[PDB]
Structures are given as structure tokens and as C-alpha cells.
Amino acid sequence: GYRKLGRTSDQRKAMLRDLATSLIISERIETTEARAKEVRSVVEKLITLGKKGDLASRRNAAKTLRNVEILNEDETTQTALQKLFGEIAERYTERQGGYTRILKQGPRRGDGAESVIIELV
Amino acid sequence: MEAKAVARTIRIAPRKVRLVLDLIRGKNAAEAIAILKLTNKASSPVIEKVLMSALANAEHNYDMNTDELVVKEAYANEGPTLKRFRPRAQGRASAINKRTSHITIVVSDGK
Amino acid sequence: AVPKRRTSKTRKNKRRTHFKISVPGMTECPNCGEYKLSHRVCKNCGSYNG
Amino acid sequence: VKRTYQPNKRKHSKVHGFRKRMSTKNGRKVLARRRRKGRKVLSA
RNA sequence: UAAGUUAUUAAGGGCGCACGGUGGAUGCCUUGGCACUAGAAGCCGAUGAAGGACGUUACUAACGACGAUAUGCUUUGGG
RNA sequence: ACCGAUAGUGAACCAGUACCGUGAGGGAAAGGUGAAAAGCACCCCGGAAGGGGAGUGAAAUAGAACCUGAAACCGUGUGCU
RNA sequence: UGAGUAGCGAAAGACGGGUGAGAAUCCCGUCCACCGAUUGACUAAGGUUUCCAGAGGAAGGCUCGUCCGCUCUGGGUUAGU
RNA sequence: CGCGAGCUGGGUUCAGAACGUCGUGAGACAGUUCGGUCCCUAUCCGUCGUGGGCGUAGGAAAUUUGAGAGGAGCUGUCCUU
RNA sequence: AUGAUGAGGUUAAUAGGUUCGAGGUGGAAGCAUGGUGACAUGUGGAGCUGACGAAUACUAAUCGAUCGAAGACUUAA
């Protein structure tokens, strides 16, 4: 991988799957600059798969994405995959890559570690 | 004249606070708020307090313009230390010094 | 190892020459007016405009 | 490691109590010599 | 132009001085002790001792006083 | 022609006490605002603590950490270098 | 002084939303991971009020803390077997 | 008899046990044999790498010369004459 | 190691994404077929693919700020 995140391989992969699911559930999250520099490249490729649409492209999405349900569909219950293949894909069906953007906030207290707001473009 | 504010017996070792104080010493006081507001260090908030108090002693109870104010003299002195213990191995014991500081800031108008 | 001889308080202050910390590298926000930290989002009021 | 003090109320009172000091000539000497010094706690 | 001479910088440090902080020496002081002198007196307890535990107050952790009559009761004197 | 708070009793102060030990036993440290609490109303900064004023006081650099306040040590500025 | 040096005591957290002067750490939630002849349930000794609620954040907590086995104020232990 | 704050602990000289032997004995060797905790976070000089300051009589970018200093330096065999 | 060194900061290919390849693996899922079943074959050198090459401003290198010279002295030309 590009940069080990101070974690181990299984632990880091779990970290990144969780961050990617949370990003496409909340559409913007505040994290650390390196975690964001990695979640960037993960969710880019997930939404590429979503834009493809085919069934194999769905089962490949379904391995690097967690199982949360979006209760707040106003009584509707989407899974994260249904979200990613309807809403996120249909939204970004025009642009050729570059689906997020990171914004530095400043030094978190307790670490001094920079905080970023990674969100969907 | 020359207004001053003091914070006596703050719970930070004084030579960690002197780091931050060596930045605002001599700056236009309109800058020093933002400088202390933007830096990583931890002694910055408890100095922002003292600075804003010494600047609120200029408008009130004297009559000065708080744009005309440079940080003439900032500094930090030692307070009373709290001597604690830390058990090392094999029955040994090592003393700890939870030190304090007195943060003094003096803002002026140059008149 | 142990120090063979205590450090004179001149040598202490010579060693502590470079222990200073640097400025934050800040700019004036063109919207907030107040100061921001370059390439960061204005804590005081609103957007980043970049 | 098992350390040397393993508390026990029954043993503590059986071997250092008041009634066990009041049973000897020397236990009585012990209590008198703690009263000469004026201790708060005589026995244990 | 060429050949020569010479500094100003002080990141810092040195000495002198001015001004501050910690710290509790010194100065003065006493509700405390030390060594004696003169005078008493030198035992208490089965009619429960010395010593304690537990309590007692309008609000009571503790100290002194007190004992279910308890932060005290009667009387004899002084004040 | 004794001590004067590291002295004098271990103990000037809730001391045979904190504390230490299974136990016998060992055992400290700790005084001082002012003549009088008059112990700082009210305003301002601050979440508070702490400050700056205004006050009390003869004195607040006498503000309960409260007589004087040394040295170590730590700082801020400058005259020569 | 050494020196802003060594150490911060085996290990998986993430994010959203709250609360708030201040949040990596406090509360909630979803996901993820760990134990599961035990990191679960009940008890003897021993500790002795640490148990609970509402407030607090000077000290303790190897950081932070709005939190706590900590500080304050109130409470809580029921037997013929 | 270079080098244990670079490494080892195999022998020799810690406590155990045994053989031969000397000693009445506790025990000892001319000896022999099985087993047997090797701690240290580098302050100064030194060394090896790397930055900052000022200087190099204006402020810069680039290319260089070389006073010096370091590196290398070994060797066989087969064919021809 | 950090600093430094280089490559860039939109008038821009510096990194990420995207579309192509390179190399690596070794024939993806679904479907149809044959087997009663484990399976096999075709669709099809397919599908996936971290670090390598190329193109593409989609995202982020925004806006700003600081430091930095005015050339001493003689003597000869």
C-alpha cells in the first residue's frame, strides 16, 4: 500500500472499509489528513464501480463496503450498496473522476494532528 | 500609561510557557490574539486569557485605544511546585515536580 | 552513562539556542477579515474559497 | 509471588488481641509499657 | 581598475546594572519547654481502680467537659 | 549572667498523632496579617482560579500561602564586548 | 544538572449526533474487532462505605477530561427457615 | 600479552557434589570431574553523517580552479617466442 | 531520521481519480449445455490487478505573507 497508517494489514483494511462506508453514508466526515488521503483513493474506486452498474461490479462493491442500514430514509431502509448505486452514482454520472475534496481544518487538540473535512464533490 | 494583567499559579511548567511568550513579545496586540489562537502549543489558551484581560484593562479603568497597543513586556516566573512521587522498580522512588508559573503581560500605548 | 561534570549554565543556554518555536505561518482572511492559517478553513466565519 | 502478610481477622486477634496479652505476665508488661508511652491503640 | 588596510552584523554567549519570582536564612517575639529553690502531701481498687470504647449539643469531624439525670443535677459560700 | 521555633520536652500547632511494622516497636513535620477583621462593597476581563481598579487600613510589595525576607535557582531589559 | 531527555505498564478502534468555555478520550448510536473451562455467573477470606442519585473539576488519574473507585451534598444493607 | 559503557563465558580463582591423595579432625591440593545471574538511557573529548548563523567591503543565480586531504595499489595459470 | 536535496504550485501534469497499456495471475460472475452428483465445457487468454509508461484539469497544490542593495579607506593607473 501507499502509506501504512500505524496499523496492521487486517486492522488497516477494516479501518478503511469503515471510513469509506461512513463517508458514503454521511457524505462528509472529519478525519485525520492521512486517513483522508487514503479514504480518498478508496471511495473514488468504489464510485467508479457504482457508475459501471453491472452485477459483478455490484458484488465487487459488496466486499469493500460494510453493512449498515440508513434508517433516515423517512421510514425507508436503504443498505449502503443501494445508496451507492442509486443516489451517488446517478449524481456523479457526468464527471470523469475526482469525486471528493479534502479541506484542512487545523490542529486537533490532544494530538496537534491536522483535521480535514473529506466530502463528496 | 502601561496596563498589565497577571495569572498567578497556572499549572504549566514555566519553561514550556516561555516558548509561547517568546512569540508575542513586542507584537502589535491585534496580531498577538491571532498568533496565540493559531499555534499548536497548549500554553496558548491560558495566555490568550491573560492577554485579553490586560487589553480589557486598557479600555476599562484606564482610557486607552486598544489598536494602539503593543505587547511591551510579557514574561513568566516560577510559582510553587507540587512535589509528587513515581514508583520506579525494586523499591526505588523518583520525585516528580508538577511546577507552576506566573504569567505576566504588560501592554502599552507607547506614550 | 552518567554526566561526569555538571553542565554550566552557559552551555545550557547555548544548547537551547535552537529550541525556539516558529511562527504559525498565518494570513488575513479575505472574507472573515480576521486571521486564518494558510491553506486551512477560517475558524471564525465560513468558507475557504479555493 | 505470595507475600508474607495474608490478612486474617481470627489469627490477628488470637495472637495479638487484648485477651491474649492479658493472659501472660509479659503481655501485661506489654500493655503497661504502651500506656507508659500513651499509645492510642493498645492491642490489635 | 589593481594592490592593500578596516570595521558593521550577534543566531547566541560574557561581564556590569536595573527590575521581578521562587525560597525560607537572619532580626525581633511567645500561648512552650529546661534546672532548681520553699511549702505541702507521696497512694488508688470488690462501696469496682488506672485506662479506655461508645455516646451527650439547635446545627457536631474533631478537641475539652459530662454519663441514658450525659455540652451536665441539688446544696453550701463567693462573685 | 537557662532555650527562644534545625533551639527547648519526641511534641509551643488537635503529638506519642500522619506514617512505618504481623508484632513487640520506631516516629516525624507543622508558630508570627493588623491596634482593631475594619478580612477587600461596587465596576471591569474571565467558566472558574487569578487579576486591574475603587475601597479598609498608618501601611495591601500587611490579602488568611498573610512580620523582615538572604543565598542557591529561574527570568525580563539594557552599557561595554 | 543530566533535560524538554528516558518513560507514559502486554492488546483495535471508526464515524455520526449531543453536551459543553474547551472533546481522540464524556454521553448516546451504528459498524468493526477481543474473551467465551472465560476478560462471563455466583461465593469464602480480605477490604470496609469504594455502592446509588444530584452537583464539582484546585489535588489524584502516568495525556485530556465536561468524566471517575476522586471532591461536596443527600441516601442505601430488612430473615422463625 | 589492542579492543567485555562492542560480543561470548568455554578455562582460572564464589557457594553444591564426587575421585585420588595429604590431615586424627574441621578441611587442603601437586591435581581431576559434573553444575553455576557478565548491570549502565553517553554529559565532555573523539569519530561518522547531516542542518542553522555570520563571514568572504553591494544584493544574487550558475559554472568552476585546486592549496590540501582521502581511495585504489594484490596475484596465479595457459599459448607464443 | 528531521531539516536539507531535487520535481511542481493553475499562465498548472506535482500527487489522487479517470481512460488506455506494461507486467502478474491464470480462464471471473451470470447464463446455456452435458453429468443423477462431486464437476466439465462454451460465452472468453476472460476477469481482476499496489508501486511501471502515457494522456486527461475531474480533486487538491486558493488567496496571501515575509526576507532581501544602494556599494568604507587609502595609494598608484
Total domains in chain B come to 1
D15: buried, middle or exposed (CB in 10 Å: 19+, 13-18, 0-12)? exposed
Q: Write out the H or E segment, with its range, that includes residue D15.
A: helix D9-16
Q: Provide the residue range defining the domain that includes C49.
A: 2-50
C45: buried, middle or exposed (CB in 10 Å: 19+, 13-18, 0-12)? exposed
Contact A103 C41 (CB under 8 A): yes
Dihedral-angle region of residue B19 (phi above 0 means left; psi in -120 to 50 means alpha; beta otherwise): alpha
Residues 24-43 of chain D in contact with strand E via CB under 7 angstroms: 35, 38, 40, 42
Total domains in chain C come to 1
**HEC per residue, C20-44:** CCCCCCEEECCCCCCEEECCCCCCC
Dihedral-angle region of residue A106 (phi above 0 means left; psi in -120 to 50 means alpha; beta otherwise): left
Q: From the Cβ of B61, is strand F under 7 Å away?
A: yes
**What subunits touch chain D, counting only 3 or more CB pairs under 8 A?**
none
User: Domains of chain A by range and CATH?
Assistant: 1-121 (3.90.1030.10)
**CA C34/CA B33 separation, integer angstroms:** 10
**CA B34/CA C27 separation, integer angstroms:** 10
Residue B61 C-alpha, separation from nearest chain C C-alpha, in angstroms: 27
**HEC per residue, chain A:** CCCCCCCCHHHHHHHHHHHHHHHHHHCEEEEEHHHHHHHHHHHHHHHHHHHHCCHHHHHHHCCCCCCCEECCCCCCCEEHHHHHHHHHHHHCCCCCCCCEECCEEEECCCCCCEEEEEEEC
Q: Are strands A78-79 and B101-108 parallel, antiparallel or unpaired?
A: unpaired
B101: buried, middle or exposed (CB in 10 Å: 19+, 13-18, 0-12)? buried
* Cβ contacts of C37 on chain A, cutoff 8 Å: 106
CATH code for the domain of B14:
3.90.470.10
Rg (CA), chain B: 17
Contact A106 C43 (CB under 8 A): yes
Q: From the Cβ of B98, is strand G under 7 Å away?
A: yes
Quick one: cell of A1? Answer: 500500500
**CA D38/CA D32 separation, integer angstroms:** 9
B90 touches chain A (CB under 8 A): no
User: Domains of chain D by range and CATH?
Assistant: 1-44 (1.10.287.3980)
Contact between A92 and A99 under an 8 Å Cβ cutoff? The reply is: yes
The residue of chain C with its CA nearest to that of A106 is: C40
Angle between helix axes B45-59 and B14-24 (nearest 10 degrees) is 50
How many beta carbons lie within 10 A of that of residue A120, not counting itself?
16
B76 phi, psi to nearest 5 deg: -145, 130
Q: Identify the experimental approach.
A: cryo-EM
Interface contacts (A, B; CB < 8 Å): 3
Dihedral-angle region of residue D5 (phi above 0 means left; psi in -120 to 50 means alpha; beta otherwise): beta
Contact C40 A117 (CB under 8 A): no
Q: Provide the residue range defining the domain that includes B52.
A: 1-111
Contact between A121 and A94 under an 8 Å Cβ cutoff? The reply is: no
